[PDB]
Amino acid sequence: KVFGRCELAAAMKRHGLDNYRGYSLGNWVCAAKFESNFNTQATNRNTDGSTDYGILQINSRWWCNDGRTPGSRNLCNIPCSALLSSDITASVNCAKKIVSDGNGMNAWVAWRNRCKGTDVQAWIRGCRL
């Protein structure tokens, strides 16, 4: 599913991301834009042989099991395929564990490089929330 900007903002808010660990909703929307272009089916291989999955490009190295990432962990206790669903529940719940693990949203390279320190509230401008 490719979400609209405001549609994803609303779904993320419903699922408890607005100000989660102090990150405003616009941070989360910005991150999804530049990780996946708001596409739940996005996948991308990493150099180490892990893969990133879903709207927030969650990494099989640590967070999910995809059956082909040796020596990795599954800290969200999910198949990676769950992160590709049209329903963002699994991606949001796993993102809440990631963002709580000490490094905040710096875990997401795209957030760090394209959202952090910018006017992220712009990502929710005009949305009914």
Ligand code: NA
């Ligand atoms: Na894994």
